[PDB]
Write an enzyme that holds these catalytic residues in place. Structure first.
Site, PDB file in Angstrom:
ATOM      1  N   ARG A 218      31.069  38.856 128.702  1.00 55.83           N
ATOM      2  CA  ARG A 218      30.284  38.871 127.415  1.00 55.83           C
ATOM      3  C   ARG A 218      30.384  37.542 126.596  1.00 55.83           C
ATOM      4  NH1 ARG A 218      31.813  44.985 125.192  1.00 55.83           N
ATOM      5  NH2 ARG A 218      31.760  46.009 127.244  1.00 55.83           N
ATOM      6  N   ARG A 230      39.948  39.465 122.612  1.00 56.39           N
ATOM      7  CA  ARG A 230      38.520  39.398 122.823  1.00 56.39           C
ATOM      8  C   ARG A 230      38.033  38.044 123.740  1.00 56.39           C
ATOM      9  NH1 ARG A 230      33.969  41.659 120.036  1.00 56.39           N
ATOM     10  NH2 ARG A 230      35.537  42.892 118.773  1.00 56.39           N
ATOM     11  N   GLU A 302      41.154  48.891 119.140  1.00 50.93           N
ATOM     12  CA  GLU A 302      40.520  49.784 120.080  1.00 50.93           C
ATOM     13  C   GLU A 302      40.765  49.045 121.375  1.00 50.93           C
ATOM     14  OE1 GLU A 302      35.530  49.337 121.072  1.00 50.93           O
ATOM     15  OE2 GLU A 302      36.631  48.199 119.530  1.00 50.93           O
ATOM     16  N   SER A 305      36.094  52.924 124.521  1.00 51.65           N
ATOM     17  CA  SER A 305      34.966  53.573 123.826  1.00 51.65           C
ATOM     18  C   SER A 305      34.262  54.677 124.721  1.00 51.65           C
ATOM     19  CB  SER A 305      33.914  52.600 123.535  1.00 51.65           C
ATOM     20  OG  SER A 305      33.303  52.913 122.303  1.00 51.65           O
ATOM     21  N   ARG A 344      43.408  44.534 127.497  1.00 48.17           N
ATOM     22  CA  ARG A 344      43.923  45.030 126.171  1.00 48.17           C
ATOM     23  C   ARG A 344      44.964  45.960 126.444  1.00 48.17           C
ATOM     24  NH1 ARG A 344      39.120  45.703 121.390  1.00 48.17           N
ATOM     25  NH2 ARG A 344      38.469  43.597 121.772  1.00 48.17           N
TER      26      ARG A 344
END
Ligand code: FZQ
Ligand code: FZQ
Ligand code: NA
Ligand code: NA
Lengths: 377, 422
Positions: A218, A230, A302, A305, A344
């Site tokens: 990303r 991130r 988070e 998802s 994560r």
């Protein structure tokens, strides 16, 4: 894409439902293009402009989705586990991992710039142990069929799942001369969901459950400057379901439970959030986020998802199944969920499993993958 | 990069050694640049002597009450020409530096001299290719049977030279990569690493893919940012861990292993998984003391052979000749695995000693215990192994009469009770 009939028969009800997401449906352009095509047929260009408009419309949120404007309106539906109370000053994953050079941001920056990581020895082995445990769990116990996919895709696959045309800026593109350009996958959802594009499946084939462990890329064009929360590149074990439309909301509960089982087995305390209308992703009808406890942050963050996309991606892909009742090829429903984002999970493992001396206890389920290592450092 | 003093002083001996690779060193341009450097240097030295003398003469002329204007004008002109002489010397050095970055490595004296692959020698072979009691099927026919190896869905996603694997074949491919990393970390003294798969240009220049082989890479163009390239091999990210460093001799050897996808533009093998744009590879890299590198190459080659031996895959070891080597290699051994449907051995690994060539480009050094001065390390890399090609070898060598595949013994612990595929 939305049901084109709905955008014609109920334009105001569709616009009111989309307004809960903060999206303004251009009712004026649709009413005009419908009045233009009706005049041209009476007496390809007018369809081409409507198609691009239709491809820019987010999914309709399901009736059960809490109506809200931002992340502050997201609803905690449940929790699992008690966040640990430490008898010493808590360190972050950066401090823990950098101590012996086993988590190295500086060498990664020297190689590739910011938002990259180098992992070595037992920290590299722990990250690999996490991904292996995840894929072994979903294939053995959750009914997912393993898949190795390309990590480079062309534009039609991204349009099938909804990243294209609207979210090109979030992707890394490889420009190719006299060939179609390639994009690095931002998630295995892209490659896995598109397996069924342009097909009429047998009703007997449903549900189709896939799992892949892949790197994810990303641009991160649009926080978390310190650490590996991130990154431009991260590993993720992706779960994808191709299902009978009548079962998709029950399938979302099972999919979320699949992601939760990874955290429960690692004994990582977490919470489950029902995302509100104004905070959900473009292609989702309903989403649950899993947020893991992060001791150095004194909050949940988070890590997954899980979404039901309804017939939205299926419409873009022309992915169908032969309905056993009518014999008519009908659109399938698609779902996707992280089980989990590996980098994560490594952050959550290093931080929740730290000891006073700065060493890290190896989670029980990961000990068979750690070649005898029970304490890191 | 070769030793720049060696190229500049002995262009003829360097050219003769490179001629064995079929590479024609531009000795005329090297000598012409050297003649230009000498000419400019002699002029700058003469000018410095002249200017320094005229500047001191100003003080002396002032003491006599004389006009210093002619001397001031000489000093001004001489200084302006010296600044030009300096820009000229920089531009000459810049041109020679760009040229030296395009020169392949010097082959070791033990490398057989040859013009093409026909001068490559078989060192040894292990195992006996099976004689099948039925018509052998290729990996494509075997994998397509239940859709577990699917090039059609992969082409629909990504175009040509991509693959989709599912169920037990995807599991077998993962089991192979896990077996490889576990073997190297447990028995061969390698430290495991997870690395970036996207790197900037200096890392690719450090290992030798840049500046000459840009066309072989996938590049991600970025507006007002350094471009990123997809790694063609973990050799790029692993070898560059030590760039710009002066290591303690006690840290040598540094041995790294990584399991990564590998991306190549491939700018042959149209049908199948042999030559893909994306393939998994378990890479072995060594950062060693220059005195031990050729012994290190022998051990590195044995680490790769061990994967094939344990999987019971017949293979052959070839010593590459001068005319069949990679750009950055001084000596290479290629491993070739038996491929039943082709009735021949096919490349599955390349194990190379790079000497100090990559170390020079990345300034990867170590403090020599005898001199106490920083010296260049030697680097080595080898496939242990290319995972997609090993899968091709497992499917074909382990095929049964009904089209099913027997699972190799060492892979059964990773296959969740599966002993026969299909
Ligand atoms: N740079 C980043 C960006 C995201 N992530 C982590 O990937 C998860 C899935 O991403 S998603 O974008 O929220 N949905 C998806 O990709 C779906 N296919 C389901 O997986 C996030 O919940 C976050 O925990 C990260 O680790 N690093
Ligand atoms: N598209 C492709 C290209 C190559 N390969 C396989 O990668 C191996 C290593 O590549 S190398 O180019 O020969 N050397 C290297 O990359 C070194 N870092 C040592 O590993 C080859 O021996 C071949 O078996 C493949 O599987 N698919
Ligand atoms: Na998210
Ligand atoms: Na090779």
């Amino acid at each position: 894409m939305l049901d084109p009939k709905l955008v014609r028969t109920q334009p105001q009800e569709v616009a009111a439902r989309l307004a809960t997401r903060g999206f303004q449906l251009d009712v004026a352009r649709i009413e005009a293009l419908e009045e233009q095509r009706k005049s041209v047929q009476t007496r390809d260009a007018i369809q081409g402009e409507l198609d691009a408009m239709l491809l820019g419309i987010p999914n309709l949120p399901h009736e059960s989705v809490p109506v809200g404007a931002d992340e502050d309106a997201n609803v905690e539906v449940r929790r699992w586990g008690t966040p640990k109370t430490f008898d010493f000053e808590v360190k972050d994953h950066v401090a823990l991992g950098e101590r012996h050079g086993w988590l190295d941001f500086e060498t990664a920056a020297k190689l590739s710039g910011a938002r990259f990581a180098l992992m070595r020895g037992p920290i590299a082995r722990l990250h690999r142990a996490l991904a292996q445990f995840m894929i072994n769990l979903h294939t053995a116990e959750h009914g997912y069929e393993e898949a190795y996919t390309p990590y480079l895709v062309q534009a039609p696959a991204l349009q099938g799942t909804g990243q294209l045309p609207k979210f090109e800026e979030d992707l890394f593109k490889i420009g190719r001369d006299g060939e179609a350009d390639l994009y690095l996958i931002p998630t295995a959802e892209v490659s896995l969901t598109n397996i069924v594009s342009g097909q009429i499946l047998d009703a007997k084939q449903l549900p189709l459950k896939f799992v892949a462990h892949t790197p994810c890329f990303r641009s991160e064009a649009g926080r978390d400057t310190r650490g590996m929360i991130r990154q431009h590149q991260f590993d993720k074990v992706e779960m994808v379901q191709i299902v009978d439309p009548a079962t998709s909301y029950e399938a979302l509960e099972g999919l979320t439970a699949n992601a939760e089982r990874v955290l429960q087995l690692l004994e990582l305390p977490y919470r489950v959030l029902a995302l509100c209308t104004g905070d959900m992703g473009f292609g989702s009808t309903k989403t649950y986020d899993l947020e893991v406890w992060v001791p150095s942050q004194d909050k949940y963050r988070e890590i997954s998802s899980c979404s039901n996309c309804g017939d939205f991606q299926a419409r873009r892909m022309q992915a169908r199944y032969r309905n056993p009742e009518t014999g008519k090829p009908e659109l399938v429903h698609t779902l996707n969920g992280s089980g989990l984002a590996v980098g994560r999970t490594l952050v959550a493992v290093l931080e929740n499993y730290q000891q006073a001396d700065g060493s890290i206890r190896v989670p029980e389920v990961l000990k068979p993958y750690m070649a005898g290592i029970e304490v890191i450092g």
